[PDB]
Every structure is written in structure tokens, then in C-alpha cells.
């Protein structure tokens, strides 16, 4: 990872949190194209000091994906270790995460907008699958909205998938249970079951988020009830905008071996 000088990074407002992390907006002073100096807005992910035991998984999460370049994958700028802190520096967007965007703009987002964003997420996932790279935490909170729909130019919305954060293979059981239904049943049985098939299930859950205006599936269920949901082999309810209901259920197949390839997912989205 590129090491960003302490003097070149400034912390601004708190934006939220991730698993064992605090997230901030920041500013980075950098030499850019043609030697032009820029003050670039950045997203700062800071690992909690109390959870330093996860530093390897925290950085490995961003490192493996940073080795790849794709139009729908987040840009990583580097790391900063100012005051012994573990800080990930990534690109910043004013529009925030997809989950909050869906909720704030629920009355203005139609089926074509949802289909476009689903195709883009499926494109990123197909790229990762072709590279045999497991993501392991596909969800709308981990997706950034780069550009809003622009009807004046006919430009569609544009998204990028960010890194998965600390791996479910090292997280406490209680966190994984809270993550149902993004975490598939086989990973609840054993987190060592993390596989490319995991991402097909989580993509199904993320598509449900996209179709539900930022509602969180099973948010009314506590962890014990979330376990019962899997025990009784339930399926998520069809979203009110049900055009993608069949695809969500086909992805969220209790048999990991039967989950369709991302190439088949793209062809299904293209046939809508
Ligand atoms: C969940 C949230 C705290 C962080 C969401 N998030 C990001 N959010 C922003 N912008 C932003 C976020 C806001 F929360 C907000 O209020 C706002 F105005 C702007 N830019 C980039 C990313 N990147 C690189 C990322 O990995 C993810 C995790 C997808």
C-alpha cells in the first residue's frame, strides 16, 4: 500500500461506522497529473484501537481488491499510520452509500434505475468471479454512489463496490448472526464455508435492498429469530417492486452449488 504522509491528511466530520471501525470524511494534499497540487476529499476508515487484533484482516480486505482495477470497484489511495492509528484512505463521494441513497430518494427511484444499478453490481461481481476473488461482504452499505441519474444528458446512476472490511472468517459469532440475511446459511453453520458462492447469496440480499428503498431485510428479527429464519428455510418477502423477486430467490438458494454464475445473472438482468 502507498503510505500517505501524516502532514498530508486532515480528518474532517464523522460519517458513520463499519464493523469495528469509525468512518470520517478527510482531505488529502497530493501531487496530481501534470504536477498540479490538489486538496482531494477522501474517505477515512479507522480501525478501533480496542480492536487492533483485527488489523491484518482490516488491511487485507482492501489490499486484495486494490490489486485489481475495474470501473465498478472503489479506488484505494493508501494507508496512514499517524499516531499508531490504522487508517485506510479511499475515494470519497458526496452522495454517500447506496443504502442511505435508496432511502432518501425512495419516491424518485423507479424500476429502470434499480435495474441499471443491479447490472453494475452484477458486472463488478462477474469481474471478481472471473478473477476467483471472494468479496465476502456484499451489501448496499458497502456500495458508493458516484453519480446520480442525469436526465438532461441521459446519464444513468453509477455505483462502485467498496472493500468487505474485516472477514467473516475472523469475526465473532454474534456479529455474523446479526448479519443474516447477508451472511448465507452455510457461513452461519461454519464461517470457513466462505466461498465464491457466498457472494451470489449476498448479491441476492443486496438486490432485495435495492428493490426495497433502503429497508433492511429481517431488521425486525433479533439474532435468535434470524437463526430460526434459516432453520425453517424461509425466503425473503418479494419486494413491492417485484420485477427482480425471482432473481433474488434464485441467488438466495440454500444449496450454494446451485447459485447461478454472475454471467447467468447478467444475462437474466439483460432479458428484463
Ligand atoms: C457507511 C458510510 C459511513 C460510508 C459509506 N462509504 C463511502 N461513503 C462516502 N461518502 C459519504 C458517506 C456518508 F456517510 C455521507 O453522509 C456522505 F455525505 C458521504 N464516500 C465513499 C465511501 N466509500 C469509499 C466506502 O467504502 C463506503 C463504506 C461505501
- Output the CA 13–ligand 1 centroid distance in Å: 12
**What is the separation of C-alpha 91 from the centre of its chain, rounded to a whole number of angstroms?**
14
Taking CA 272 as the corner, what is the angle to CA 149 and CA 68, rounded to the nearest 5 degrees? 60
3-state secondary structure of 161: strand
Going by their DSSP bridges, the two strands 143-147 and 87-91 should be labelled as: unpaired
| Own/partner long-range contacts of 212-216 (Cβ < 8 Å, ≥24 apart) | 212/102, 212/239, 212/240, 213/102, 213/103, 213/106, 213/109, 214/99, 214/100, 214/101, 214/102, 214/103, 214/104, 214/106, 214/140, 215/103, 216/99
89 close to 9: Cβ distance less than 8 angstroms: yes
Residue 11 φ/ψ, nearest 5 degrees = -80, 135
Please give the number of the atom of ligand 1 that sits closest to the Cα of 16: 3
Structural domains present in the chain: 1-92 (3.30.200.20), 93-272 (1.10.510.10)
Please give the number of the atom of ligand 1 that sits closest to the Cα of 94: 19
249 close to 204: Cβ distance less than 8 angstroms: yes
- Residue 206, Cβ density class (10 Å: 0-12 exposed, 13-18 middle, ≥19 buried): buried
By what method was this entry solved? X-ray
Residue with CA closest to ligand 1 atom 10: 96
Residue 239 φ/ψ, nearest 5 degrees = -65, 150
How far CA 105 is from CA of 81, 183, 210, 243, 255, in Å, comes to: 37, 27, 12, 19, 35
Residue partners of 5: CB distance under 8 A and separation at least 6: none
Residue with CA closest to ligand 1 atom 28: 142
Number of H helices and E strands in the chain, helices first, is 9, 7
With a 6 Å cutoff on the Cβ, whether 44 touches ligand 1 is no
Residue 240 CA to residue 99 CA, distance in Å, equals: 17
* Given resolution (angstroms): 1.6
Name the β-bridge partners of 88: 45, 79
- Output the CA 120–ligand 1 centroid distance in Å: 18
With a 6 Å cutoff on the Cβ, whether 97 touches ligand 1 is yes
Amino acid at each position: 500500500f502507498h503510505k500517505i504522509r501524516n502532514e498530508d491528511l486532515i480528518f474532517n466530520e464523522s460519517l458513520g461506522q463499519g464493523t469495528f471501525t469509525k468512518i470520517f470524511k478527510g482531505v488529502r494534499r497530493e501531487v496530481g497529473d501534470y504536477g498540479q497540487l490538489h486538496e482531494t476529499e477522501v474517505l477515512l476508515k479507522v480501525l478501533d484501537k480496542a480492536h487492533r487484533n483485527y488489523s491484518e484482516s482490516f488491511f487485507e480486505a482492501a489490499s486484495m481488491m486494490s490489486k485489481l482495477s475495474h470501473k465498478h470497484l472503489v479506488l484505494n489511495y493508501g494507508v496512514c499510520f499517524c499516531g499508531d492509528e490504522n487508517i485506510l484512505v479511499q475515494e470519497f463521494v458526496k452522495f454517500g452509500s447506496l443504502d442511505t441513497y435508496l432511502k432518501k430518494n425512495k419516491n424518485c427511484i423507479n424500476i429502470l434505475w434499480k435495474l441499471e444499478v443491479a447490472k453494475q453490481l452484477a458486472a463488478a461481481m462477474h469481474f471478481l468471479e472471473e478473477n476467483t476473488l471472494i468479496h465476502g461482504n456484499v451489501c448496499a452499505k458497502n456500495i458508493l454512489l458516484i453519480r446520480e441519474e442525469d436526465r438532461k444528458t441521459g446519464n444513468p446512476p453509477f455505483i462502485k463496490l467498496s472493500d468487505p472490511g474485516i472477514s467473516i472468517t475472523v469475526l465473532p459469532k454474534d456479529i455474523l448472526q446479526e448479519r443474516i440475511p447477508w451472511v448465507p446459511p452455510e457461513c452461519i453453520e461454519n464461517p470457513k464455508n466462505l466461498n465464491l458462492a457466498t457472494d451470489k447469496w449476498s448479491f441476492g440480499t443486496t438486490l432485495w435492498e435495492i428493490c426495497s428503498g433502503g429497508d433492511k431485510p429481517l431488521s425486525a428479527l433479533d439474532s435468535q429469530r434470524k437463526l430460526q429464519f434459516y432453520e425453517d428455510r424461509h425466503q425473503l418477502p418479494a419486494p413491492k417492486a417485484a420485477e427482480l423477486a425471482n432473481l433474488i430467490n434464485n441467488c438466495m438458494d440454500y444449496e450454494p452449488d446451485h447459485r447461478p454464475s454472475f454471467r447467468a445473472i447478467i444475462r437474466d438482468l439483460n432479458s428484463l
